[PDB]
């Protein structure tokens, strides 16, 4: 369907987060990636709508107001650790929503390079075993 | 880096379980 499913998911996540940052997209999506975007966008907007206090609480724990390189690295490692602890597709969707809030809170606009790599790094980890994530969001309605 | 792993984990678990419930009702 695509050449590499993990790459598709990684591209979709970076694109989505940038879209929620109101950042000009640097790269557009393929036909297949755009299909996955539409599915993920609906799920993540619904999580944001239902669990905003829960995500805001996490952001308080993560001290998202601190955009220093040291604290951004700390946020990355804590999110990666939580994902390794609970690797399910639904968790990955929740984490995408969490990143969206982090970006909306700390005012990320593309120039904080450590934050850009946080987005890249977590997109990479979410994209591992993408087959399971794709099956979850396809069948979520299919 | 793990000081909040349990607290964050518990929050992710509740959101994930609910998403699974919606999926199960598809
Ligand atoms: Na620095």
CATH number of the domain that residue A86 is part of: 1.10.437.10
Cα(A75)–Cα(A120) distance, integer angstroms: 13
Q: Please say whether the beta carbons of B1 and A118 come within 8 A.
A: no
**Which residues of chain B neighbour A77 with C-beta distances below 8 Å?**
1
**Closest chain A C-alpha to B21 CA, distance in angstroms:** 10
Cα(A28)–Cα(A16) distance, integer angstroms: 11
Resolution (A): 1.8
Domain count along chain A: 1
If DSSP codes are grouped into helix, strand and coil, which group holds residue A7?
helix
- So where are chain B's domains? 1-26
A58 to chain B, any CB pair closer than 8 A? The answer is yes
Distance from the alpha carbon of residue A93 to the mean position of ligand 1, in angstroms: 30
Cα(A3)–Cα(A50) distance, integer angstroms: 35
- Name the interface residues of B facing A (CB cutoff 8 Å): 1-5, 7-9, 11-20, 22-23, 26
The approach used to solve this structure was: X-ray
- CA torsion A77-A78-A79-A85 (nearest 10°) is 110
């Amino acid at each position: 369907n695509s050449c590499n499913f993990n790459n598709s998911i990684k591209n979709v996540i970076v694109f989505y987060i940038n879209e929620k940052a109101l950042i000009e997209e640097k790269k557009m999506l393929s036909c297949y990636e755009n299909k996955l975007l539409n599915l993920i966008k609906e799920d993540c907007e619904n999580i944001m709508l239902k669990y905003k206090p829960n995500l805001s609480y996490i952001c308080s724990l993560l001290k998202v107001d601190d955009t220093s390189e040291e604290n951004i690295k700390h946020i990355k490692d804590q999110i990666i650790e939580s994902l390794e602890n609970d690797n399910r597709p639904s968790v990955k969707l929740a984490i995408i929503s969490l990143i969206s809030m982090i970006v909306e809170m700390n005012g990320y606009k593309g120039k904080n390079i450590p934050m850009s790599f946080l987005i890249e790094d977590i997109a990479l980890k979410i994209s591992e075993n993408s087959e399971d994530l794709i099956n979850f969001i396809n069948i979520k309605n299919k | 880096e793990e000081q909040w792993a349990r607290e964050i984990g518990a929050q992710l678990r509740r959101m994930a379980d609910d998403l699974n419930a919606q999926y199960e009702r598809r």
